[PDB]
A and B are shown apart, each in its own frame.
Chain A
Amino acid sequence: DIQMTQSPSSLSASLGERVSLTCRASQEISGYLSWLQQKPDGTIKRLIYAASTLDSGVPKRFSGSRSGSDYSLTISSLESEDFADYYCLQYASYPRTFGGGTKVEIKRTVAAPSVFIFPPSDEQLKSGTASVVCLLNNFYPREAKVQWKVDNALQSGNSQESVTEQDSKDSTYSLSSTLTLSKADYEKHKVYACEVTHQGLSSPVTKSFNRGEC
């Protein structure tokens, strides 16, 4: 098997920056190499083949080159859409082999999250459970702290959060936090709040709701 050694494994770059990824073939592959791009959604597309030939419709900012066993992919001006994992593919002999891939991360300016809080839906309440959801939308960097407060009392042990990958449009992240309680426990308290801490904020932003009868 021809080993394709791709470096680096991860690359962080600012928008507009000129970046390059490299793949070294352990054997002579005579230019039979393609560059594939896999976006966060799992979509894979070929950008280059024959080492330096761009596919139809591929943006001019992408270019491939070869120097002996070193094959490189270059992006002239990194754009948010370029956030993806890139893989080189050897098609000179069998078995076909892929490089390890290079995860391209994008650096951008600090952005404060827009916070939203959602009460449990009435239909969920009928099932005996209650999920309060807190949304931190479009922020940067990824680091952020979210604290649940029920009647001003800090919560622990009943929540789970998840953060997205960088957005293909603006390179920001979004976080979702869910506080799951039993219907009875939910009905025992009045004020449900979500306190958010992030560099883009001078002070913690708190969003809340009061479970009133509807």
Chain B
Amino acid sequence: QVQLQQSGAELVKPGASVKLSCTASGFNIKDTYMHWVKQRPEQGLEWIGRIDPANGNTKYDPKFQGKATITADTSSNTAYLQLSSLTSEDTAVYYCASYYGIYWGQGTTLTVSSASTKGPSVFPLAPSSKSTSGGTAALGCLVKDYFPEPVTVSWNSGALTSGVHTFPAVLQSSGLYSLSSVVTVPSSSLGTQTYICNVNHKPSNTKVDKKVEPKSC
């Protein structure tokens, strides 16, 4: 297989600098040209620049000429995007892309803020709450009180993806986010199958695995 793995999401203070990475697996320098793209809601994709790992040559979108610096290391097969003098306008998702734009990284969410990071508390949303439903049952996890976004939620370490809905986070009056991830499953196998949600909030290095099962009463 082949893909581009980008560094984790993070929060950085205004005025500071940060360096994002994009490591390639499968291919390497041979393809040449590693591009960096910026994206914000209601704003399309914006090209920052690109680098030729073979000779270190770089080309930038004029607007980023004094804001972004792209570097590459063929040995470790990694490209870096250094952003300086961070401002609220730098809060976005950054994507790295290979030659011809065939391979794209999963993106890195950068939040510029003067606030502290906050790890979430993960609570189970047990199936068959009081009693069983008409054939199908729902279950999930409540990821509450975290900052900033985003949070990654998997089920059974990737083994469960069918019928999953991870809702957009809501901003609570405290300035902290909260979201839920739910799954609909057969009610008949609640006693035989195991469902565990895998939560990860990179900005605070919080990683939680919560087994969601029907509670006794």
Contacts and interface: CB of A to CB of B under 8 A. Distances in A.
Interface in A147-202: 160-164, 167, 174-176, 178, 180
A160 B44 contact: no
B170 interface: yes
Nearest to A94: B59
B136 interface: yes
A55 B180 CA distance: 36
A138 B46 CA distance: 34
Contact of B101 (A43, A46, A119): A46
Given A131-B123, A162-B179, A98 B46 contact: yes
A135 B93 CA distance: 29
Chain A interface SS verdict (over half)? strand
B47 A95 contact: yes
A97 interface: yes
Given A89-B101, A116-B138, A160-B170, A212 B182 contact: no
B122 to A, nearest CB: 9
Nearest to B109: A42
Interface in A31-70: 34, 36, 38, 42-46, 49, 55
B165 A164 contact: yes
B30 interface: no
Contacts of B133: 116
Contact of A87 (B45, B123, B136, B178): B45
Interface string B121-132: 101111001100
B215 A122 contact: yes
B130 A162 contact: no
Given A135-B182, A176-B167, A119 B138 contact: no
B201 interface: no
Given A34-B101, A44-B104, A114-B136, A162 B123 contact: no
B49 to A, nearest CB: 8
Contact of A55 (B102, B169, B216): B102
Nearest to A38: B45
B119 interface: no
A121 interface: yes
A163 B165 CA distance: 10
Interface of A: 1, 34, 36, 38, 42-46, 49, 55, 87, 89, 91, 94-101, 114, 116-124, 127, 131, 133, 135, 137, 160-164, 167, 174-176, 178, 180, 209-210, 212, 214
Interface of B: 35, 44-47, 49-50, 59-62, 93, 95, 97, 100-102, 104, 106-107, 121, 123-126, 129-130, 133, 136-138, 140, 142, 144, 165, 167-170, 172, 178-180, 182, 184, 215-217
Given A116-B182, A174-B182, 12 more contacts: A1-B61, A42-B107, A49-B100, A95-B59, A96-B47, A133-B125, A133-B140, A135-B138, A135-B182, A163-B168, A167-B165, A176-B180
